[PDB]
């Protein structure tokens, strides 16, 4: 854990986490001559890899879905074999990430229940995509054999596979707009498919980090009505092992430059400082973040 160099783990290069890490690092790096922190971004497999690799020491921060923030801390669900990681700390939360289904026009897939018996990219092993897909799979009584093909491509390979007719649909736990879904919809005629019904309703009712989501009509070519699903929040997490001064300066960089931050990616346009402190954060805030929030009056 260096005091003067930090690495943020994100996701595939055509998702939202990757440019989010870039935006955070830009706001840290602009004052590196003062606080001495150089911030670097890594593209990664996603939430699960990010938690595990903060733990093993190679990442200082990671962008992690609110459900895997909770389970990574507690050593539950996807993290059960790894055991608890009670040093994990929240920093702030960010944009909403719906459970998106992106299907071929000819796929016959009109809702989440239609994924069974199709070629479905359920997600790569390090991703929040695959881990939250397992939750959906649980709700339906599905296993990997419920699909004709349970493909595990990382995010930046999914649109090509869908358009090349190697899968009927891919799922993606991701904010909007993003490049992967823009490509599939605007260059290969894919559709965004809702996830509704009693199984999704149970998922939302039974968990505080799953809430109903809506993608508006016009977000993407060809999706001409709004699309309902459920969603999580993207969150920035770290470890107690990272120094309070480092987390303080990173948190201050984002919040004291909030009007700039919310101009850096269209997914950030409607963030609210107060919600960023609490929403989607179910584990202790890092003391360095708390220190800034108390200075700013966001925590009394
Ligand atoms: N939530 C996805 C990443 C989404 C993104 O890259 O923006 C994951 O944890 O795998
Ligand atoms: Na899992
Ligand atoms: Na809920
Ligand atoms: Na603004
Ligand atoms: Na507004
Ligand atoms: Na909270």
Author numbering: 29 to 328
What do the authors say?
Tripartite ATP-independent periplasmic (TRAP) transporters are a large family of SBP-dependent secondary-active transporters that are found exclusively in prokaryotes to catalyze the uptake of a variety of substrates, primarily organic anions, across the cytoplasmic membrane. A defining feature of TRAP transporters is the obligate utilization of an SBP, which is either found in the periplasm or attached to the outer leaflet of the cytoplasmic membrane, where it binds and delivers the substrate to the membrane component.
To investigate the selectivity determinants of VcGluP, we solved the structure of VcGluP in the presence of excess (0.5 mM) L-glutamate to 1.7 Å, using molecular replacement. The refined model obtained in the presence of 0.5 mM L-glutamate contains residues 29–328, which equates to all of the 299 residues of mature VcGluP. VcGluP is composed of 2 α/β domains connected by a hinge composed of antiparallel β-sheets (residues 116–131 and 255–267). Comparison with other SBP structures reveals that VcGluP belongs to Cluster F. In addition, each domain contains a disulfide bond; Cys53–Cys67 in domain 1 which connects a1 with B2, and Cys191–Cys216 in domain 2 that connects a8 and a9, although density for this disulfide is missing likely through radiation damage. As expected, in the presence of ligand, VcGluP adopts a closed conformation wherein the two domains completely envelope the ligand binding site.
